[PDB]
């Protein structure tokens, strides 16, 4: 049972800007997704300070980076707070309408695309490098869901049948054919050292057979 939704017009506009603007500095997508993972880990940590049972779904707070050259996918996994179904539908838990407005007024004032994360819509930078993005998420108060979009104005949401997650979010980037550099170990390491070197959670870069 798959539900198909239209993006709000402003978010479709944001996505088509990201996909169609000539902008060579695409590597910042990974900084932005790791930053969102760190924000999600901070949230479940804060809730656990007054209610330790919030970690019954998983005590370890970490980020995994999983490249898969056979599938041409880069997956960013975190064990943060996750998202409910309602969060997923409501622009993956972001204030994306007003964030997109503020971003586009910043661009008019001399900002560039790399500042997207300052406006709360850094998730959508995934579309710098991915043709399709799948988000699998589990929040303590809801069931496990899969969101998916290849842009083009719509996204889908379905109950996830896959491997149970416990709690957190998995972003699966189905990379564009010309963006496979982001599956190479040395390139990922370079980007994490350049842009994410002070993130307060362990990051494990998986290797491949
Ligand atoms: O966990 C990390 N830092 O806390 C690493 C350090 C370098 C090599 C791996 C990939 C980049 C982050 C792991």
Residue numbers in the entry: 16 to 224
Paper text:
Heat-shock protein 90 (HSP90) is a highly active molecular chaperone that plays a crucial role in cellular function. It facilitates the folding, assembly and stability of various oncogenic proteins, particularly kinases and transcription factors involved in regulating tumor growth and maintenance signaling pathways. The N-terminal domain is highly conserved in HSP90 homologs and contains an ATP-binding motif that belongs to the GHKL superfamily. This ATP-binding site is essential for the ATPase activity of HSP90, which is necessary for its functional cycle and for binding client proteins.
In this paper, high-diffraction-resolution crystals of the N-terminal domain of human HSP90α were employed in crystallographic fragment screening to discover binding fragments and binding sites. A diverse library of 800 structurally distinct fragments was screened, yielding 91 starting points for the fragment-based drug design of new HSP90α N-terminal inhibitors. Finally, the optimized crystals were fully grown after being incubated at 4°C for 3–5 days in crystallization buffer containing 22% PEG 4000. They remained stable after soaking for 6 h in crystallization droplets with added compounds at a final concentration of 25 mM. A total of 948 data sets covering 768 compounds were obtained, of which 738 were utilized in PanDDA analysis to identify hit compounds. These crystals belonged to space group I222 and exhibited diffraction to an average resolution of 1.79 Å. One HSP90N monomer was identified in the asymmetric unit. Electron density was observed for residues 6–310, with only five residues missing at the N-terminus and one residue missing at the C-terminus.
